[PDB]
Amino acid sequence: EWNDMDLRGTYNKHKGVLIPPRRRQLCFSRIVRGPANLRSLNEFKEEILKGAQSEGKFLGNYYKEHKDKEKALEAMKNSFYDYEDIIKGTDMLTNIEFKDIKIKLDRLLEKETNNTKKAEDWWKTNKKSIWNAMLCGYKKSGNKIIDPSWCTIPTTETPPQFLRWIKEWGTNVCIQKQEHKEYVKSKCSNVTNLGAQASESNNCTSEIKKYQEWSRKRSIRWETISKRYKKYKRMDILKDVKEEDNEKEAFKQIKEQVKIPAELENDYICNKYKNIHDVTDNFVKKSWEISNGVLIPPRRKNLFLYIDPSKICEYKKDPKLFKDFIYWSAFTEVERLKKAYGGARAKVVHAMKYSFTDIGSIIKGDDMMEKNSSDKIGKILGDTDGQNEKRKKWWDMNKYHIWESMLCGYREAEGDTETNENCRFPDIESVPQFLRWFQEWSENFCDRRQKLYDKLNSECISAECTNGSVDNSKCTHACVNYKNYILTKKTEYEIQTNKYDNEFKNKNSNDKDAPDYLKEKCNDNKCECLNK
């Protein structure tokens, strides 16, 4: 069982270090001490080799318990990586006098004040010695890396000091968390299939509650583990005076798979942007021109997608680079989309939200306004009209990565601005595909609608007109905006009339009526300007 309280009491130094659940049971063959006064130099070298020899015998039988290859390799690397840190470190650990007494005996026996450094060579006199001993035996006893007429793994280079402990700590938490995720997926996997009642779900609900309490205990001490970790990175000691998930909430909270039966009754993430290091046309303030009666989408007319036919063969030869190139295409947006819009928070945030939904629509493979892009996509993948779950989830993870990338850039721009915008993605962007059609149509109505009444004050209604022809023209040329808005309303009526022709009323005409669809779609009085 988890001996956290017992470990804290026995350790007595108040550092929240908890061993994994598997690191409490071992073959009870080690004795506190063997011979009392039988002391000889080379013999106790063999004794620590015997310890290494003992380290060759627990994991030999323990390997058969976890027959999984990935789990076996993880456990074996952890076993042969943890123990060498204490012996190789030659520093203070959670041990009373075991290394201290032997080092005392070493400096007392060999020579005075001139053998400690050579004692370090003792480790390199025996760290490689243990590896060569196992090479003599056959490979049947222990599976290794498959080689021609040979089965061994390459020697692992010793990590630098202060880096080994975090690697041992890091691999420990990952294995435990993946084991418990495997347990939570194994238990209560299917609930909606004849399990809507609370009878059979009780055990898995209790398991989820226990796991949540686990995460609550694990969240608190990690910062304390980070607390001593931050204070132990002292550099330049000689001084005058001593001195995939989104955030941590994913770790504390449970995975969304339990959300179905859950119905009510320091900056390393941004550094990847550095790792992805290594065009403007002014299409937002342009003058709208009528051409063939079809409005040109400003968001889609200047799509940043240029496919080079010279590297089509590399799409079949080395796709793996091109995938990163696809990520580099996202990098184009993080060097193009952010700078183009402006500085106003709300308009810019809705701007790139609409840009991302438009590019996702373009890469949904359902709209066929472009021929070359559709043909190239069919050649590369041969997708279907709308049956692309993998492509949809791919766009979803690109959207999540681009949103996480935008957060660091906007946050880094200012130093004291308040984060009014939500760090995570609101559910409003998760609306269905005809809902995002409705969003695109609705976003162009009440903005300039509200702007229209603002222009009334700026007009010259106070000044009067008399004597036939007007005396001023600057206050009368602005009246063409009403006719332009009427033309926009007419083209929106034409497009919506065309919208009915898409389905043709074969089946599933509409989820609900449009008069209530427009008003109930908004949340907490958000449709005030929409057809008011």
Coordinates of C-alpha atoms in Angstrom, one line a residue:
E1 CA 0.0 0.0 0.0
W2 CA 1.0 3.7 -0.4
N3 CA 3.2 4.3 2.6
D4 CA 3.2 8.1 2.2
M5 CA 2.6 8.7 5.9
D6 CA 5.1 6.0 7.0
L7 CA 7.7 7.3 4.5
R8 CA 7.3 10.9 5.8
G9 CA 7.5 9.7 9.4
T10 CA 10.6 7.5 8.9
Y11 CA 12.4 10.0 6.6
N12 CA 11.6 12.9 9.0
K13 CA 13.0 15.5 6.6
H14 CA 9.5 16.6 5.4
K15 CA 10.3 16.2 1.6
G16 CA 7.3 14.8 -0.3
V17 CA 9.1 12.0 -2.2
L18 CA 6.9 8.9 -2.6
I19 CA 8.2 5.6 -4.0
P20 CA 6.1 4.0 -6.8
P21 CA 3.6 1.2 -5.8
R22 CA 5.9 -1.5 -7.2
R23 CA 8.9 -0.1 -5.3
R24 CA 7.9 -1.6 -1.9
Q25 CA 8.1 -5.4 -2.5
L26 CA 11.4 -7.2 -3.4
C27 CA 13.1 -10.5 -2.9
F28 CA 13.9 -10.5 0.9
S29 CA 17.3 -12.0 0.6
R30 CA 19.5 -9.0 1.6
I31 CA 20.8 -9.2 5.1
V32 CA 21.9 -6.2 7.3
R33 CA 25.4 -7.6 7.4
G34 CA 27.2 -10.9 6.7
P35 CA 30.7 -11.6 8.1
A36 CA 31.6 -9.4 11.0
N37 CA 35.4 -9.0 11.0
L38 CA 36.2 -10.7 7.6
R39 CA 37.5 -7.6 6.0
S40 CA 39.7 -7.5 2.9
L41 CA 40.1 -4.9 0.1
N42 CA 39.4 -6.8 -3.2
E43 CA 36.7 -8.9 -1.4
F44 CA 34.6 -5.9 -0.6
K45 CA 35.0 -4.7 -4.2
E46 CA 33.5 -8.1 -5.1
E47 CA 31.0 -7.4 -2.4
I48 CA 29.7 -4.3 -4.2
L49 CA 30.0 -6.3 -7.3
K50 CA 28.0 -8.9 -5.4
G51 CA 25.5 -6.1 -4.8
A52 CA 25.7 -5.5 -8.6
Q53 CA 25.5 -9.3 -8.8
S54 CA 22.4 -9.1 -6.6
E55 CA 21.1 -6.4 -8.9
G56 CA 21.5 -8.9 -11.7
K57 CA 19.2 -11.4 -9.9
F58 CA 16.1 -9.4 -8.7
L59 CA 15.4 -8.0 -12.2
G60 CA 16.0 -11.4 -13.8
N61 CA 13.0 -13.0 -12.1
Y62 CA 11.1 -9.6 -12.0
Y63 CA 11.3 -9.4 -15.8
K64 CA 9.0 -12.4 -16.2
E65 CA 6.2 -10.7 -14.2
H66 CA 5.7 -7.8 -16.8
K67 CA 6.0 -9.6 -20.1
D68 CA 5.1 -6.5 -22.1
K69 CA 8.0 -5.4 -24.2
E70 CA 7.5 -1.6 -23.6
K71 CA 6.9 -2.1 -19.9
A72 CA 9.8 -4.5 -19.6
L73 CA 12.2 -2.1 -21.3
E74 CA 10.9 0.8 -19.1
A75 CA 11.3 -1.2 -15.9
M76 CA 14.8 -2.5 -16.9
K77 CA 16.1 0.9 -17.8
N78 CA 14.7 2.4 -14.6
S79 CA 16.2 -0.5 -12.5
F80 CA 19.7 -0.1 -14.1
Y81 CA 19.5 3.7 -14.0
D82 CA 18.3 4.4 -10.4
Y83 CA 20.9 2.4 -8.4
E84 CA 24.0 3.7 -10.2
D85 CA 23.1 7.4 -9.3
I86 CA 23.7 6.8 -5.6
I87 CA 27.0 5.0 -6.2
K88 CA 28.1 7.4 -8.9
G89 CA 27.0 10.5 -7.1
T90 CA 29.2 10.0 -4.0
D91 CA 27.2 12.7 -2.2
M92 CA 24.6 13.0 0.5
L93 CA 21.4 11.0 0.0
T94 CA 18.7 9.4 2.2
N95 CA 21.3 7.1 3.8
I96 CA 22.8 7.2 7.3
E97 CA 26.4 6.0 7.1
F98 CA 26.7 3.2 4.4
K99 CA 28.7 5.2 1.8
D100 CA 30.3 7.4 4.5
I101 CA 31.8 4.5 6.4
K102 CA 33.2 2.8 3.3
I103 CA 34.7 6.1 2.1
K104 CA 36.3 6.6 5.5
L105 CA 37.8 3.1 5.3
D106 CA 39.1 3.9 1.8
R107 CA 40.9 7.1 2.8
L108 CA 42.2 5.5 6.0
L109 CA 43.5 2.4 4.4
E110 CA 45.0 3.4 1.0
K111 CA 46.6 6.8 1.6
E112 CA 46.0 10.1 3.3
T113 CA 44.2 13.0 1.4
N114 CA 45.3 11.8 -2.1
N115 CA 42.9 9.0 -3.1
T116 CA 39.4 10.4 -3.2
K117 CA 39.6 11.4 -6.9
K118 CA 41.0 8.0 -7.8
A119 CA 38.1 6.6 -5.8
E120 CA 35.9 8.1 -8.5
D121 CA 37.8 6.0 -11.0
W122 CA 36.8 3.1 -8.8
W123 CA 33.3 3.6 -10.1
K124 CA 34.6 3.7 -13.7
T125 CA 36.7 0.7 -12.7
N126 CA 33.5 -1.2 -11.9
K127 CA 30.6 0.5 -13.7
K128 CA 31.7 -1.0 -17.0
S129 CA 32.9 -4.2 -15.3
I130 CA 29.3 -5.3 -14.5
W131 CA 28.2 -5.0 -18.1
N132 CA 31.0 -7.1 -19.5
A133 CA 30.2 -9.9 -17.0
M134 CA 26.7 -10.5 -18.4
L135 CA 28.1 -10.5 -22.0
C136 CA 29.8 -13.9 -21.4
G137 CA 26.5 -15.7 -20.9
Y138 CA 24.0 -16.6 -23.5
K139 CA 21.2 -14.3 -24.6
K140 CA 18.5 -16.8 -24.0
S141 CA 18.1 -15.9 -20.3
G142 CA 17.6 -12.2 -21.1
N143 CA 16.0 -10.7 -24.1
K144 CA 17.9 -7.7 -25.6
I145 CA 18.0 -5.6 -28.8
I146 CA 17.9 -8.0 -31.7
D147 CA 21.1 -8.0 -33.7
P148 CA 22.7 -10.4 -36.3
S149 CA 24.2 -13.2 -34.2
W150 CA 24.0 -11.0 -31.1
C151 CA 21.4 -9.7 -28.7
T152 CA 22.5 -6.7 -26.5
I153 CA 21.6 -3.1 -25.9
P154 CA 24.2 -0.2 -26.4
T155 CA 25.9 1.1 -23.3
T156 CA 24.0 4.1 -21.8
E157 CA 26.1 7.2 -21.4
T158 CA 26.0 8.6 -17.8
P159 CA 23.9 11.7 -17.6
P160 CA 25.4 14.8 -15.9
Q161 CA 25.0 15.4 -12.2
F162 CA 21.7 17.0 -11.1
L163 CA 20.0 15.5 -14.2
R164 CA 19.8 11.9 -13.1
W165 CA 17.4 12.4 -10.2
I166 CA 14.8 14.3 -12.3
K167 CA 15.0 11.5 -15.0
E168 CA 14.4 8.9 -12.3
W169 CA 11.6 11.0 -10.8
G170 CA 10.2 11.8 -14.2
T171 CA 10.0 8.2 -15.4
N172 CA 8.5 7.1 -12.1
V173 CA 5.4 9.4 -12.3
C174 CA 4.9 8.6 -16.0
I175 CA 4.7 4.9 -15.5
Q176 CA 2.3 5.1 -12.6
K177 CA 0.0 7.6 -14.4
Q178 CA -0.1 5.4 -17.5
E179 CA -0.8 2.3 -15.4
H180 CA -3.7 4.0 -13.7
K181 CA -5.0 5.4 -17.0
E182 CA -4.9 1.8 -18.3
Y183 CA -6.9 0.7 -15.2
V184 CA -9.4 3.5 -15.6
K185 CA -10.0 2.7 -19.3
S186 CA -10.3 -1.0 -18.5
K187 CA -12.8 -0.4 -15.8
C188 CA -16.2 1.1 -16.7
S189 CA -15.3 1.4 -20.4
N190 CA -18.9 1.4 -21.6
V191 CA -21.6 3.0 -19.7
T192 CA -24.2 4.3 -22.2
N193 CA -24.9 0.8 -23.5
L194 CA -27.6 -0.5 -21.1
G195 CA -25.9 1.2 -18.2
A196 CA -27.6 4.5 -17.8
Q197 CA -28.7 3.6 -14.3
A198 CA -26.6 4.2 -11.2
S199 CA -26.3 0.5 -10.3
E200 CA -23.4 -0.8 -12.3
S201 CA -21.6 2.6 -12.4
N202 CA -21.1 2.8 -8.7
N203 CA -17.8 1.0 -8.6
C204 CA -16.3 3.1 -11.5
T205 CA -17.6 6.3 -9.9
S206 CA -15.8 5.3 -6.7
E207 CA -12.7 4.6 -8.7
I208 CA -12.9 8.0 -10.4
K209 CA -13.4 9.7 -7.0
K210 CA -10.3 7.8 -5.6
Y211 CA -8.3 8.9 -8.7
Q212 CA -9.4 12.5 -8.2
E213 CA -8.3 12.4 -4.6
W214 CA -5.0 10.9 -5.8
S215 CA -4.5 13.8 -8.2
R216 CA -5.3 16.3 -5.4
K217 CA -2.6 14.7 -3.2
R218 CA -0.2 14.5 -6.2
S219 CA -0.7 18.1 -7.3
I220 CA 0.2 19.6 -3.9
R221 CA 3.5 17.9 -3.3
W222 CA 4.9 18.4 -6.8
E223 CA 5.2 22.2 -6.2
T224 CA 6.9 21.2 -2.9
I225 CA 9.0 18.9 -5.0
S226 CA 9.5 21.9 -7.3
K227 CA 10.1 24.0 -4.2
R228 CA 13.3 22.3 -3.2
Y229 CA 14.1 21.8 -6.9
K230 CA 14.0 25.6 -7.5
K231 CA 16.2 26.2 -4.4
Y232 CA 18.7 23.5 -5.5
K233 CA 19.7 25.0 -8.9
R234 CA 22.2 27.3 -7.2
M235 CA 24.7 28.5 -9.9
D236 CA 27.7 30.6 -9.0
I237 CA 27.8 29.5 -5.4
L238 CA 30.8 31.7 -4.5
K239 CA 29.0 35.0 -3.7
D240 CA 29.1 37.8 -1.2
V241 CA 25.6 37.0 0.2
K242 CA 23.6 33.8 -0.1
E243 CA 20.4 34.1 -2.1
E244 CA -2.0 15.8 -25.0
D245 CA -3.0 18.3 -22.4
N246 CA -3.3 22.1 -22.1
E247 CA -2.4 23.1 -18.5
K248 CA -2.1 21.6 -15.0
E249 CA -5.9 21.4 -14.8
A250 CA -5.8 18.5 -17.2
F251 CA -3.6 16.6 -14.7
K252 CA -5.8 17.4 -11.7
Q253 CA -9.1 16.9 -13.6
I254 CA -10.2 13.6 -15.0
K255 CA -10.2 12.8 -18.8
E256 CA -13.3 13.7 -20.7
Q257 CA -14.1 10.0 -21.3
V258 CA -15.6 9.9 -17.8
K259 CA -17.7 13.0 -18.6
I260 CA -20.4 10.8 -20.2
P261 CA -21.2 9.1 -16.9
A262 CA -20.3 12.3 -15.0
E263 CA -23.7 14.0 -15.7
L264 CA -25.2 15.8 -12.8
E265 CA -28.0 14.0 -10.9
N266 CA 8.3 27.0 -16.2
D267 CA 7.5 28.0 -19.8
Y268 CA 8.6 24.8 -21.7
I269 CA 5.4 24.6 -23.7
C270 CA 6.1 27.9 -25.5
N271 CA 9.8 27.0 -26.2
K272 CA 8.5 24.6 -28.9
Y273 CA 7.5 27.8 -30.8
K274 CA 11.2 28.6 -30.7
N275 CA 11.8 25.1 -32.0
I276 CA 9.5 25.9 -34.9
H277 CA 11.3 28.9 -36.1
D278 CA 12.8 28.4 -39.5
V279 CA 3.2 38.1 -47.8
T280 CA 0.8 40.8 -46.6
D281 CA -1.7 41.9 -49.2
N282 CA -4.0 44.3 -47.3
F283 CA -7.2 42.4 -47.9
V284 CA -9.1 43.8 -44.9
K285 CA -9.5 47.5 -45.8
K286 CA -9.9 46.9 -49.5
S287 CA -12.7 48.3 -51.7
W288 CA -15.5 45.8 -52.4
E289 CA -16.3 45.3 -56.1
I290 CA -19.3 43.6 -57.6
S291 CA -18.4 40.8 -60.0
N292 CA -20.9 38.3 -61.4
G293 CA -23.2 38.7 -58.4
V294 CA -21.2 36.4 -56.1
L295 CA -19.5 37.9 -53.1
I296 CA -15.9 37.1 -52.7
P297 CA -15.0 35.7 -49.2
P298 CA -12.2 38.0 -47.9
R299 CA -11.1 35.3 -45.5
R300 CA -10.9 32.6 -48.1
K301 CA -9.9 34.6 -51.3
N302 CA -6.3 34.9 -50.0
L303 CA -5.8 31.4 -48.5
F304 CA -2.2 30.7 -47.6
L305 CA -1.8 27.4 -49.4
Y306 CA 0.8 26.9 -52.1
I307 CA 1.6 23.4 -53.1
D308 CA 4.7 22.8 -55.1
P309 CA 4.4 20.0 -57.7
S310 CA 8.2 19.5 -57.7
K311 CA 8.1 17.7 -54.4
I312 CA 5.0 15.5 -55.0
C313 CA 7.4 12.4 -55.1
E314 CA 8.6 13.3 -51.6
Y315 CA 5.0 13.0 -50.4
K316 CA 5.3 9.2 -51.2
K317 CA 9.0 8.8 -50.5
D318 CA 9.5 10.8 -47.2
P319 CA 6.2 11.9 -45.9
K320 CA 7.6 12.4 -42.3
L321 CA 9.4 15.6 -43.2
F322 CA 6.4 17.0 -45.0
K323 CA 4.3 16.4 -41.9
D324 CA 6.6 18.9 -40.1
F325 CA 6.3 21.0 -43.2
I326 CA 2.5 20.9 -42.5
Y327 CA 3.4 22.1 -39.0
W328 CA 5.6 24.7 -40.8
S329 CA 2.5 25.7 -42.7
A330 CA 0.9 26.4 -39.4
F331 CA 4.1 28.4 -38.6
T332 CA 3.2 30.6 -41.6
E333 CA 0.0 31.6 -39.8
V334 CA 2.0 32.4 -36.7
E335 CA 4.1 34.7 -38.8
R336 CA 1.2 36.0 -40.9
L337 CA -2.2 35.9 -39.2
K338 CA -1.3 37.6 -35.9
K339 CA 0.3 40.7 -37.3
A340 CA -2.3 41.5 -39.9
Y341 CA -5.4 42.2 -37.8
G342 CA -4.5 44.9 -35.3
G343 CA -4.6 45.5 -31.5
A344 CA -8.3 45.5 -30.4
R345 CA -8.8 42.4 -28.3
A346 CA -12.4 41.4 -29.2
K347 CA -12.4 42.1 -32.9
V348 CA -9.0 40.5 -33.4
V349 CA -9.9 37.4 -31.3
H350 CA -13.1 36.9 -33.3
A351 CA -11.1 37.6 -36.4
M352 CA -8.7 34.7 -36.1
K353 CA -11.4 32.5 -34.7
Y354 CA -13.3 33.0 -38.0
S355 CA -10.0 32.6 -39.9
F356 CA -9.4 29.3 -38.2
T357 CA -12.9 28.0 -38.8
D358 CA -12.7 29.2 -42.5
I359 CA -9.4 27.4 -43.0
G360 CA -10.8 24.3 -41.3
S361 CA -13.8 24.5 -43.6
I362 CA -11.4 24.7 -46.6
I363 CA -9.6 21.6 -45.3
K364 CA -12.8 19.7 -44.5
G365 CA -12.9 18.5 -48.2
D366 CA -16.6 19.2 -48.6
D367 CA -16.6 22.5 -50.5
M368 CA -15.6 22.3 -54.2
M369 CA -15.2 26.0 -55.2
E370 CA -11.5 25.3 -56.0
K371 CA -10.6 22.6 -58.5
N372 CA -6.8 22.4 -58.2
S373 CA -6.8 22.0 -54.4
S374 CA -9.6 19.4 -54.5
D375 CA -7.8 17.5 -57.2
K376 CA -4.5 17.5 -55.3
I377 CA -6.2 16.4 -52.1
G378 CA -7.9 13.6 -53.9
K379 CA -4.6 12.5 -55.5
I380 CA -2.7 12.6 -52.1
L381 CA -5.4 10.9 -50.0
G382 CA -8.6 10.3 -52.1
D383 CA -10.8 11.4 -49.2
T384 CA -14.6 11.3 -49.1
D385 CA -17.2 14.1 -49.3
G386 CA -17.7 14.5 -45.6
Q387 CA -16.6 11.1 -44.0
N388 CA -13.2 12.3 -42.8
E389 CA -13.0 11.7 -39.0
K390 CA -9.2 11.6 -39.0
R391 CA -8.9 14.8 -41.0
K392 CA -11.4 16.5 -38.7
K393 CA -9.5 15.5 -35.6
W394 CA -6.3 16.5 -37.3
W395 CA -7.7 20.0 -37.8
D396 CA -8.9 19.9 -34.2
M397 CA -5.4 19.3 -32.9
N398 CA -3.9 21.9 -35.2
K399 CA -6.5 24.4 -33.8
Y400 CA -5.6 23.5 -30.2
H401 CA -1.9 23.9 -31.0
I402 CA -2.4 27.2 -32.8
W403 CA -4.5 28.5 -29.9
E404 CA -1.9 27.5 -27.4
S405 CA 0.8 29.2 -29.5
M406 CA -1.3 32.4 -29.7
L407 CA -1.6 32.5 -25.9
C408 CA 2.2 32.8 -25.4
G409 CA 2.6 35.4 -28.1
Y410 CA -0.2 37.7 -26.8
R411 CA 0.9 37.1 -23.2
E412 CA 4.5 38.0 -24.0
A413 CA 3.5 41.1 -25.8
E414 CA 2.2 42.8 -22.6
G415 CA 3.5 42.6 -19.1
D416 CA 0.5 43.8 -16.9
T417 CA -2.6 43.4 -19.1
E418 CA -5.4 41.4 -17.6
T419 CA -6.4 38.1 -19.3
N420 CA -10.0 38.9 -20.0
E421 CA -10.1 36.4 -22.8
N422 CA -10.4 32.7 -21.7
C423 CA -7.1 30.8 -21.8
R424 CA -8.9 27.7 -23.1
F425 CA -11.2 27.5 -26.0
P426 CA -14.8 28.5 -25.4
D427 CA -17.5 26.0 -26.3
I428 CA -19.1 28.5 -28.7
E429 CA -16.5 27.6 -31.4
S430 CA -17.5 23.9 -31.0
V431 CA -20.9 24.5 -32.7
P432 CA -21.8 22.3 -35.7
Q433 CA -20.9 23.0 -39.3
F434 CA -24.2 24.6 -40.4
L435 CA -24.0 26.5 -37.1
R436 CA -20.7 28.0 -38.2
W437 CA -22.4 28.9 -41.5
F438 CA -25.0 30.7 -39.4
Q439 CA -22.2 32.4 -37.4
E440 CA -20.5 33.6 -40.6
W441 CA -23.8 35.0 -41.9
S442 CA -24.7 36.6 -38.5
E443 CA -21.4 38.2 -37.9
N444 CA -21.8 40.6 -40.9
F445 CA -25.2 42.0 -39.8
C446 CA -25.2 43.9 -36.5
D447 CA -21.6 45.2 -36.6
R448 CA -22.3 47.8 -39.4
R449 CA -25.9 47.8 -38.2
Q450 CA -24.8 49.4 -34.9
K451 CA -22.2 51.4 -36.8
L452 CA -25.1 52.9 -39.0
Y453 CA -26.8 54.6 -36.1
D454 CA -23.4 56.0 -35.0
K455 CA -23.0 57.7 -38.4
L456 CA -26.4 59.5 -37.8
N457 CA -24.9 61.8 -35.2
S458 CA -21.9 62.5 -37.5
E459 CA -24.2 63.5 -40.4
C460 CA -25.5 67.1 -40.9
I461 CA -29.1 66.6 -39.9
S462 CA -28.8 69.8 -37.8
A463 CA -28.0 71.9 -40.8
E464 CA -31.1 72.7 -42.9
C465 CA -31.5 72.6 -46.7
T466 CA -33.2 75.3 -48.7
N467 CA -33.1 77.2 -52.0
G468 CA -33.5 74.2 -54.2
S469 CA -30.1 72.5 -54.6
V470 CA -28.0 71.8 -51.5
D471 CA -25.1 74.0 -50.5
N472 CA -23.0 71.1 -49.1
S473 CA -22.0 67.7 -50.5
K474 CA -20.0 66.1 -47.7
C475 CA -23.1 65.4 -45.7
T476 CA -25.0 63.8 -48.6
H477 CA -22.5 61.4 -50.1
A478 CA -22.7 59.2 -47.0
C479 CA -26.3 58.1 -47.8
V480 CA -25.0 55.4 -50.2
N481 CA -24.2 53.2 -47.3
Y482 CA -27.9 52.5 -46.9
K483 CA -28.1 51.3 -50.5
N484 CA -25.0 49.2 -50.1
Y485 CA -26.5 47.6 -47.0
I486 CA -29.7 46.9 -48.9
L487 CA -27.6 45.2 -51.7
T488 CA -25.8 43.2 -49.0
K489 CA -29.2 42.1 -47.6
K490 CA -30.3 41.2 -51.1
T491 CA -27.2 39.0 -51.6
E492 CA -27.7 37.4 -48.2
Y493 CA -31.3 36.6 -49.2
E494 CA -30.1 35.1 -52.4
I495 CA -27.4 33.0 -50.6
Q496 CA -29.9 31.8 -48.0
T497 CA -32.4 30.9 -50.8
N498 CA -29.6 28.9 -52.3
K499 CA -29.0 27.3 -48.9
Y500 CA -32.3 25.5 -49.0
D501 CA -31.4 24.1 -52.4
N502 CA -28.4 22.3 -50.8
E503 CA -30.4 19.8 -48.8
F504 CA -33.4 19.9 -51.3
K505 CA -35.6 18.6 -48.4
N506 CA -34.8 14.9 -48.9
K507 CA -34.5 14.4 -45.1
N508 CA -33.5 16.3 -42.0
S509 CA -34.8 19.7 -43.2
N510 CA -33.9 21.5 -40.0
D511 CA -33.2 20.9 -36.3
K512 CA -35.7 23.6 -35.3
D513 CA -37.5 26.6 -36.7
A514 CA -35.4 29.6 -37.8
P515 CA -37.3 32.2 -35.7
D516 CA -36.5 30.3 -32.5
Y517 CA -33.2 29.0 -33.9
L518 CA -31.9 32.6 -34.2
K519 CA -32.9 33.6 -30.6
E520 CA -32.1 30.4 -28.7
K521 CA -28.7 29.9 -30.3
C522 CA -27.1 32.6 -28.2
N523 CA -26.2 32.1 -24.5
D524 CA -27.0 34.7 -21.7
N525 CA -28.4 37.4 -24.0
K526 CA -25.9 37.4 -26.8
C527 CA -28.2 37.8 -29.8
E528 CA -29.3 41.3 -29.0
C529 CA -28.0 42.8 -32.3
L530 CA -29.0 39.7 -34.4
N531 CA -32.2 40.6 -36.2
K532 CA -33.3 43.0 -33.4

